[PDB]
């Protein structure tokens, strides 16, 4: 029997069958609704669309995301989601297949009671996990300690784990992720003359950010760069025919990850929170932490990303021990190979959920279960 | 009465919906509702369980003899540890024979030491008899691991020598930078001719007092620099010497071009380094006398990567040596005794006070253009 | 004239005249600076802001704590503080007004120096003196000589007088304090399952603090006792609707006091450090420093620490079954309170510091005069 591994990210939904290297069904999380009237009889005009039939007829729609800031916060929005990604992508029978699910580090409790009951009472399956994301991103990187950063759609946490010891006081998490990028594009677009208000053009503005933008490896020497010359300056054509020209704006929205005080948050950077994280461990196990920082989440997909991390983490920490950043280039679908890796092992079959112990023991033996 | 509790038992499967519980003691008081609730003469409405279970129902209506020796957890550290790998164990089993530095940095073997086969384990594989191809992929790797003969001494040669490798190149360019910032502490040209403006306008200070006439200071002296602020509050010292520097001898703004490699400090602790080297080339000489011991194919491989790993050491300890020796020098050079501290707090010293100049630069430069902006600003509201 | 009384705290510096009950100016040790840039007029908005004017207007203020642990770091907001404190707070000019100074125990003598050469360099007061915590803590009480428990926001020392002078030797550290209670309060209620990421919040567990936790007779008594007890659940209510429950964890914040092995250090107690501290001293001043115990600081508010402490005495000491450990209510500011009862006397005008004598024996004088 072919498990299922299903990362229901705040960005992207990434599902596929176990065992497998890259997840099938990836698609974004997004409810699109028709604000417009119909006239034009017939043909199907369904009044919800859900994933890439949204994405395709945007220009008409607008778009709802189910999850905010790692939250399911719409929860028929949701449902609609997994089952578009059940019986629309994958085109399979819940009930005769295991389903791996994700989550995000201090998730409310009733949060994941009711993600467990979706997930048993309205699409039945025989089995079902929930596991943190970051731990499943360590497991796609083959070792079994390390610090996880993981920076989604609305989240940018950090997990330290020690020997699979997920250390709980030593989670953080800051509210700075790719959405909030997106919302300071169309803040600092504007200076060029380009409006974008509505959700449709937030999808364009999301393009364009995964497009041409990338991490400054300085901040101060890319500001002269871009004030003396115009050599950085991209041009992008828009699905209207209109071709745009960026310039400082290609990294001017990654610095919000290492500089918050542009969105106005009085929280450091990344570097920052990652350091904070590891002082709160103990002091023995920093050493393997700091050769050992994991990247996962597509807000790590900017080609600088990596040198100014080892350049911000070298200069905060002491440089008396090893200083190596983890950064696959497969890392965005890390959540979904850690999970495929999971799944798919003779050990797991016993820390599987079942029906029986469903019925036992409510909505409520996830939390006792797993971590 | 117990008329709530009467309830016939469904004959499908109900979902469960979660609710906190009271107990029973504590339900029946007499100025509780359960009380009246209870008696007969309540209004019990009865609800439809038919349309109910037809709406809240739940639509639900090999070789396990795997003979594995270990137990669960280990087993499933062993599969993560197995999968990363992206090949057979056979590949495994032969790279970890054949001497490959590629695919195996300090964590892995790390994980690999940290997954031992144990002493019942490895009897429990010998005593075994029947077919190898009924084993798990755990079993067979461990099965693979002690067809190589002395494994463990191969993965402690991989281990020691990768992290020899990288605590060589981690200690070497930062003993290098130890060794050029006492050299040219002990060598210096700029540091005179400062020395000689800050205590012509130190003695010129402390006139008529104890603490005056002196022909000298230690190092530390240069931090009490900053300690100085004028009436204003803002102006320190350090920023009235670098502003008559500025105008007068700007060969001391070359000052911190001598001492940039006493910049940065060691930023560590050198006997952490210097203890962590010796316990690195006590363990090189023990893995080279074990692998003395052992057979040919072993020395063939690793007795040429062992001897270089301890002459690299064997340097750096020279290097250290040489550090002691201008560390004695450097203590006698700012006339203090060696019992204390004069290394470390030295080069933090020396960090500390180049930070402290290079903030003075800074903020003369803003002061002077800042000075010119609003010189500008005054003969502009002057010229309107 | 009358005198001026600071007690320059780490958490809440308080200022008065002699001879008041209580203090007239309570403030927060906080400096605000401006958050966000921007410049305009505005009627003249000012640089800084210190204590309630930066309290009431904080949210556009990045503030700074700079009393760490405390002992002085940062001079410059220490200065920008004394000038608040006299200034504006209880708009005087200090070069009439002899001023009390208080300082934390076993601090460092250029601390002292540098404390000393800027009340006569900046500020040119004719008259100050330096005393330690505990010595006006004693002198709220009333007496000479004797051991003195001080815990404030910064540090917990013990320290013994002989009369009215220190005894540096037997002075005992123990590295907490009220910062170091609210962060393991703000620990173990999110333990309970509450979460404490804001400024608010900050002040409601600060105010759950003042309000509700206490120290019990017993400890292991009260918690054989704390899932039975009717009377130990409190909780509060946030302004915006928030509700804070709190249980057994009201006499775990305090109890971090006697047992420091609660939050993970093996540092000696409140009343283990005063009992190896009065062991420290000569012996012929022990029945004295044992019949002057006096508690005090805004960390002693916890009702019951009077009888837990005669109870740790009795235990650790055999001699100690009667003498009772004196607990003032106004213990909050028995430091501010001691110094109005000290500068107050006539005794007192001797021992001031004249401004000859620090430019005749350079800033060691604190050494010498403060003692
Ligand atoms: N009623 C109360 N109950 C409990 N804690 C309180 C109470 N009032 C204030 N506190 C806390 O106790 C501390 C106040 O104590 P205090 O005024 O002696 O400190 P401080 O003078 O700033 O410190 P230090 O003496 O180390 O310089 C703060 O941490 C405050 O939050
Ligand atoms: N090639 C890319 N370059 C830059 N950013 C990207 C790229 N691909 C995706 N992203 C950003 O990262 C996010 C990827 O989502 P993902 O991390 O897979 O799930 P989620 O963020 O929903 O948990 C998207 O929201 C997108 O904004
Ligand atoms: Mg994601
Ligand atoms: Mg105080």
Chains 1, 3 share one sequence.
């Not at chain 1, 997920?166 to 594009?185: E, S």
């Not at chain 1, 919000?256 to 196990?285: R, V």
């Not at chain 2, 519980?21 to 100025?31: D, F, G, M, Q, T």
Request: hydrophobic share 40%.
């Amino acid at each position: 029997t072919t498990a299922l591994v299903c990362d229901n990210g705040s960005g992207l939904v990434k599902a596929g069958f176990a065992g497998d290297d890259a997840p099938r069904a990836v698609f974004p999380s997004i409810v699109g609704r028709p604000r417009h009237q119909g006239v034009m009889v017939g043909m199907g005009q369904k009044d919800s669309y859900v994933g890439d039939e949204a994405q395709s007829k945007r220009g008409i729609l607008t778009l709802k995301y189910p999850i905010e800031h790692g939250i399911i916060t719409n929860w028929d929005d949701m449902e609609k989601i997994w089952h578009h990604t059940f019986y629309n992508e994958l085109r399979v029978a819940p009930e005769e297949h295991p389903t791996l699910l994700t989550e995000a580090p201090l998730n409310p409790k009733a949060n994941r009671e009711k993600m467990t009951q979706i997930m048993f009472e309205t699409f039945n399956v025989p089995a079902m996990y929930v596991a943190i994301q970051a731990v499943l991103s360590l497991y796609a990187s083959g070792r079994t300690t390390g610090i996880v950063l993981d920076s989604g759609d609305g989240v940018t946490h950090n997990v330290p784990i020690y020997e699979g010891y997920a250390l709980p006081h030593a989670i953080m998490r800051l509210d700075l992720a790719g959405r909030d990028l997106t919302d300071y594009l169309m803040k600092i677009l504007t200076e060029r003359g380009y409006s974008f208000v509505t959700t449709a053009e937030r999808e364009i503005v999301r393009d364009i950010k995964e497009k041409l933008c990338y991490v400054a490896l300085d901040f101060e020497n890319e500001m002269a760069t871009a004030a003396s010359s115009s050599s950085l300056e991209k041009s992008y054509e828009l699905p209207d025919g209109q071709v745009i020209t960026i310039g400082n704006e290609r990294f001017r929205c990654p610095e919000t990850l290492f500089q918050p005080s542009f969105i106005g948050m009085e929280s450091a950077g990344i570097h920052e929170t990652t350091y904070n994280s590891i002082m709160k461990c103990d002091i023995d196990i920093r050493k393997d932490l700091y050769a050992n920082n994991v990247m996962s989440g597509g807000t790590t997909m900017y080609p600088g990303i990596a040198d100014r991390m080892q350049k911000e983490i070298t200069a905060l920490a002491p440089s008396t021990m090893k200083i190596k950043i983890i950064a696959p280039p497969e890392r965005k679908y890390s959540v979904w190979i850690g999970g495929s890796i999971l799944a798919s092992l003779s050990t797991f079959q016993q820390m599987w959920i079942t029906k029986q112990e469903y019925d036992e023991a409510g909505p409520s033996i996830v939390h006792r279960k797993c971590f | 009465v117990p008329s709530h509790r009467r309830v016939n038992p469904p004959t499908l499967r109900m979902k469960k919906l979660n609710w906190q519980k009271l107990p029973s003691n504590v339900a029946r008081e007499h100025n509780s509702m359960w009380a009246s609730l209870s008696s007969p003469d309540a209004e019990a409405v009865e609800p439809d369980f038919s349309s109910i279970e037809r709406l809240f129902s739940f639509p639900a209506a090999k070789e396990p003899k795997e003979i594995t020796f270990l137990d669960a957890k280990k087993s499933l550290n062993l599969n993560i540890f197995l999968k990363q790998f992206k090949c057979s164990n056979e590949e495994v089993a032969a790279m970890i024979r054949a001497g490959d530095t590629t695919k195996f940095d300090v964590e892995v073997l790390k994980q690999l030491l940290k997954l031992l086969p144990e002493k019942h384990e490895i009897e429990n594989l010998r005593a075994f008899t029947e077919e190898r191809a009924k084993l798990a992929s755990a079993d067979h790797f461990y099965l693979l691991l002690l067809a190589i003969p002395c494994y463990q001494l191969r993965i402690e040669c991989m281990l020691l020598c990768e992290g020899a490798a990288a605590v060589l190149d981690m200690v070497r360019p930062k003993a290098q930078l130890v060794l050029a910032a006492c050299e040219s502490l002990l060598t210096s040209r700029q540091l005179p001719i400062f020395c000689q403006l800050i205590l012509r306008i130190g003695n010129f200070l402390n006139y008529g007092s104890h603490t005056g006439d002196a022909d000298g200071f230690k190092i530390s002296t240069l931090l009490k620099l900053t300690e100085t602020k004028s009436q204003q509050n803002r102006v320190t010292l350090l920023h009235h010497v670098l502003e008559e520097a500025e105008k007068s001898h700007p060969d001391l703004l070359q000052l911190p071009r001598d001492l940039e490699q006493p910049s940065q400090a060691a930023g560590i602790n050198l006997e952490i380094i210097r203890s962590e080297a010796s316990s690195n080339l006590k363990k090189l000489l023990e893995t080279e006398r074990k692998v003395s011991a052992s057979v040919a194919e072993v020395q063939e491989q690793y007795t040429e990567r062992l001897q270089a790993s301890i002459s690299a050491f064997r340097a750096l300890d020279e290097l250290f040596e040489a550090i002691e020796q201008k560390q004695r020098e450097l203590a006698d050079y700012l006339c203090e005794d060696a019992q204390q501290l004069s290394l470390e707090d030295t080069f933090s010293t020396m960090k500390a006070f180049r930070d402290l100049f290079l903030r003075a630069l800074k903020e003369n430069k803003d002061r002077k253009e800042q000075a010119a902006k609003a010189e500008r600003r005054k003969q502009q509201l002057a010229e309107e």
